[PDB]
Structure formats: C-alpha cells, structure tokens
C-alpha cells in the first residue's frame, strides 16, 4: 500500500521508469518486459501493478480481468472550464497519412503498397485500418494486402516485418517496443517520412508533433505539414488540417490498467504522482516530468496534459465502447471469448 510497481516495455521505458522511481522516493518502482503482452502477464501474476495501454491492448487486458483506472487526457478547447482530472476524455483520430508527392495514392489504391503500422494489435496502427480492410475485401488475408510493411509484433520473417529496421545494430527487428526504429506513433510516421513506406497508420496528433519544427529530431527537423496528405474513406485526399472530416475512426484514449483488486490503490498513488511530476507539477520542469521524453512517448504520450478520473466506473467494454469492441471482435475472427494466457 502506497507503493506501485510500474511495468516498462523495453529498455528506454525502463530508463525513464528508473528515473521516476528515483524521484518518487521508491513510491513507484519498475518491472520491465520486452512486450506489452508480457507486461500484462506480469500484472496478472501480481508482479507489477500498472502500465498505460493503447485501447487495442486494453481489450486484451480486459478479457483477462484487468480494469481501466485513469485515462490520458490531452489539450482541449471545449470543457476548458473544468479541471483536467475531472474533464471527460475526447478520443483521438485514427488517420492514414501519405506523402503529397505520392500523387494518386488513395484509400482505394492501397493494395500492394508499402505500409507503416504502430504495432500489431494497436488501435490506429492496426485494429482500425486492418478491420476496415478485412471488411472491404471480405478476406482474412491481411498478410497479403500490402506488398511489405513494418508492423511491429508480426512474424519477423514475414512481409509484415520486411520494412522494420531494428535497433542501432539491426538487432530486435520488428519487436513491439521502442528498440524497433519504426515502432509506435513516432516510428510509423518516421517509416513514412523516410519513404520506407507509402502510408502510415497513426493518429492526427503525430503529424503535427513531428512537422514544422515541432520535433527537432534529425529525421523530423525538415518535415513540412504541406508535404503530407490524409487518406479519407471516400477516396479523397486532404490536408492534415482536415482531420475532423478525413479520419478512419475516433479512438479511445490510452489508459492506465491494473488488476481490479489493485485499482483503487493504483489510482490514489498516480493522482499524487501527477500532482508532483505532471504538467504543472511541483517538481516537473525542475526535477522530473512524467509526460516528457523528447517525442518518444515513453510510458505516456508526450501530449498528455493529465490522467483523468473515469467516472461511471466503466468496465473495459464501456471504456472502449461497443462500436470499438465489435470491430476488434470481428477482426480477431481472422486470427469467441477468453483471456489469451
């Protein structure tokens, strides 16, 4: 009680966690796994308490009895009167992004192109676009739709991993952690920016955060918003300013999950942790900021303003929404209920 073990995915999340652990006075400690699924297993066993998950994994976790505790909440124009912790979460926009110079590439001509996914089983990077594609083609052969992909977490020797690059040394090709060059929102967008892939499946925010000087990372320094287009489902292409009307779906925010028996305790610690290291935390800019990691989205997305209370004490199914749960169920038919472990 009062002590929470956080599960870090990969070495860079471990390093961030160790620092947070140090600054928390060991009120938070760290477990590390190579994959998010392994972190989920550590939580089930009771060897870790919590990690922040994409909605695709909240679905995995939820079937195993884990619960949403607090959600990532980003910058808002509406509800602005309300305190961030009490403000409802809005959801992010899942988009398909292409290079402008790649003229005449539309939603309807993606077959045999090269693709960049955040990771297998993630909302924007996988579940939404491949759910749409399985539906549209009436085929479960989503391994044969694109000529080559980087989809971290797929078989490293299938074409779904052909475009993945591994780490500094070429090791760890296609691992679903940040050692993979093209892992996650930032990695998938980089995959597109370097013209390894033709399309990246990311969220609206990723384009903005890595273009027009917002990043300063060497691959992203010279990236310009006007050089990218969104692919809409009507066959159109739009500027990245038109995400409201050109997206694949609205995605439930990333959320902290814990075993239901630990939820209350995890919630209490985390609220106090963000008072100290969150956006206006006592200690953030000065000693440690929970929600920064130079564009890398380690443990939390860099654009998190705060972690919000849920309210309505939602199950994972109500948190994800029936719309999203049925999408995943339908897609998982290709690869009807149980915990995977």
Ligand X SMILES: CC(C)/N=C\[C@@H](O)COc1cccc2ccccc12
Ligand Y SMILES: *[C@@H]1O[C@H](CO)[C@@H](O[C@@H]2O[C@H](CO)[C@@H](O[C@@H]3O[C@H](CO)[C@@H](O)[C@H](O)[C@@H]3O)[C@H](O)[C@H]2NC(C)=O)[C@H](O)[C@H]1NC(C)=O
Ligand Z SMILES: *[C@@H]1O[C@H](CO)[C@@H](O[C@@H]2O[C@H](CO)[C@@H](O)[C@H](O)[C@H]2NC(C)=O)[C@H](O)[C@H]1NC(C)=O
Which residues participate in the annotated binding site for hydrogencarbonate? 118, 122, 124-125
Spatial separation of the C-alpha atoms in residues 110 and 149, rounded to whole Å: 12
Residue with structure tokens 């309300």?
Answer: 82
Examine residue 54 and tell whether it contacts Fe ion (CB under 5 A). Answer: yes
Q: Which is nearer to Zn ion, 146 or 324 (CB)?
A: 324
- The helix or strand, by DSSP H or E, that contains position 31, with its residue range, turns out to be strand 28-33
Q: Total number of residues binding Fe ion (CB under 5 A)? A: 2
For the CB of residue 206, give the shortest distance to ligand X in the complex, in Å: 17
Using CB under 6 A as the binding criterion, the count of chain residues that bind ligand X stands at: 11
123, 186, 273, 293: which one contacts Fe ion (CB under 5 A)?
A: 123
Is residue 131 a contact point for ligand Y (CB under 6 A)? yes
E strand spans, 34-81: 50-53, 66-74
Pick the closest to residue 191 from 162, 216, 212, 171 (CA basis): 162
Give whichever of 208 and 219 is closer to ligand Z, judged by the CB atom. Answer: 208
Q: Which residue is nearest to ligand X (CB)?
A: 312
CA distance 86 to 153: 35
Structural tokens at position 317: 């199914």
Segment lying near Fe ion (by CB under 5 A), choices 46-54, 131-139, 265-273, 289-297: 46-54
327 binds ligand Y (CB under 6 A): yes
Binding residue (CB under 6 A) for ligand Z from 99, 100, 208, 314: 208
Residue 27 binding ligand Z, by CB under 6 A: yes
Is 302 a binding residue for Fe ion by CB under 5 A? The answer is no
Mask for 71-110, x = binds ligand Y (CB under 6 A): ----------------------------------------
Cα(90)–Cα(11) distance, integer angstroms? 31
Q: Which of 131, 184, 197, 252 binds ligand X (CB under 6 A)?
A: 252
User: If we measure between CA atoms, which residue out of 21, 19, 63 comes closest to residue 40?
Assistant: 63
- Contacts with ligand Z by CB under 6 A: the residue count is 15
Cα angle 206, 227, 184 (rounded to 5 degrees) comes to: 25
Residue 106, both tokens: 């539309």
CA distance 30 to 48: 8
- Asked if 215 interacts with ligand Z (CB under 6 A), we say no
Structure tokens given for 190: 């980089």
Q: Could you say whether residue 194 binds ligand Y (CB under 6 A)?
A: no
User: What is the spatial distance between Cα 71 and Cα 257, in angstroms, rounded to a whole number?
Assistant: 9
Residue 123: name its binding partner from Fe ion, ligand X, ligand Y, none (Cβ under 5 to 8 Å by kind).
Fe ion
Q: Long-range contacts made by residues 72-77, C-beta under 8 angstroms, separation at least 24?
A: 72/253, 72/254, 72/255, 72/300, 72/301, 72/304, 72/307, 72/308, 73/253, 73/304, 73/305, 73/306, 73/307, 73/308, 74/205, 74/253, 74/301, 74/303, 74/304, 74/305, 75/303, 75/305, 76/305
Residue nearest to Zn ion (CB): 318
319 touching ligand X, by CB under 6 A = yes
Q: How far is the CB of 275 from ligand Y (least distance, A)?
A: 38
Binding segment (CB under 6 A) for ligand Y, from list 90-98, 130-138, 201-209, 301-309: 130-138
Does 205 engage in binding with Fe ion (CB under 5 A)? no
Residues that bind ligand X (CB under 6 A): 89, 91, 252-253, 310-312, 314, 318-319, 321
Residues that bind Zn ion (CB under 5 A): 318
Residues that bind ligand Z (CB under 6 A): 2, 24-25, 27, 75, 77, 93, 204-205, 208, 214, 243-244, 276, 303
């Amino acid at each position: 009680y009062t002590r929470v073990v956080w599960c870090a995915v990969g070495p860079e999340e471990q390093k961030k966690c160790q620092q947070w652990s140090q600054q928390s006075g060991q009120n938070v400690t760290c477990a590390t796994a190579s994959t998010t699924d392994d972190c989920i297993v550590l939580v089930l066993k009771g060897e870790a308490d919590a990690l922040n998950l994409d909605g695709g994994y909240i679905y995995t976790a939820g079937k195993c009895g884990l619960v949403p505790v607090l959600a990532e909440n980003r910058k808002s124009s509406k509800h602005s009167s309300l305190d961030c912790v009490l403000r409802p979460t809005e959801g992010y926009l899942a988009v398909a992004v292409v290079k402008k110079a790649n003229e005449g590439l539309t939603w309807n001509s993606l077959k045999d192109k090269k693709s960049c996914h955040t990771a297998v089983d993630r909302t924007a990077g996988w579940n939404i676009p491949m759910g749409l594609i399985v539906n549209q083609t009436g085929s479960c052969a989503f391994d044969e739709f694109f000529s080559q992909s980087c989809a971290p977490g797929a078989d490293p020797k299938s074409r779904l991993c052909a475009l993945c690059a591994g780490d500094d040394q070429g090791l760890d090709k296609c691992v679903p952690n940040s050692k993979e060059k093209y892992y996650g929102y930032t990695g998938a967008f980089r995959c597109l920016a370097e013209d390894v892939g033709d399309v990246a499946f990311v969220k609206n925010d990723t384009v903005w955060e890595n273009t027009n000087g917002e990043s300063t990372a060497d691959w992203a320094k010279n990236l310009k918003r006007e050089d990218f287009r969104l692919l809409c489902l009507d066959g159109t292409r739009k500027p990245v300013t038109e995400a409201q009307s050109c997206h694949l779906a609205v995605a439930p925010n990333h959320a902290v999950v814990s075993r239901s028996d630990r939820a209350a305790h995890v919630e209490q610690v985390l609220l106090h942790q963000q008072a100290l290291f969150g956006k206006n935390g006592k200690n953030c800019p000065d000693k440690f900021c929970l929600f920064k990691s130079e564009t890398k989205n380690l443990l939390f997305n860099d654009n998190t303003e705060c972690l919000a209370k849920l309210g309505g004490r939602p199950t994972y199914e109500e948190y994800l929404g029936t719309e999203y749960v049925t999408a995943i169920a339908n897609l998982k038919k290709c690869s009807l209920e149980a915990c995977a472990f």
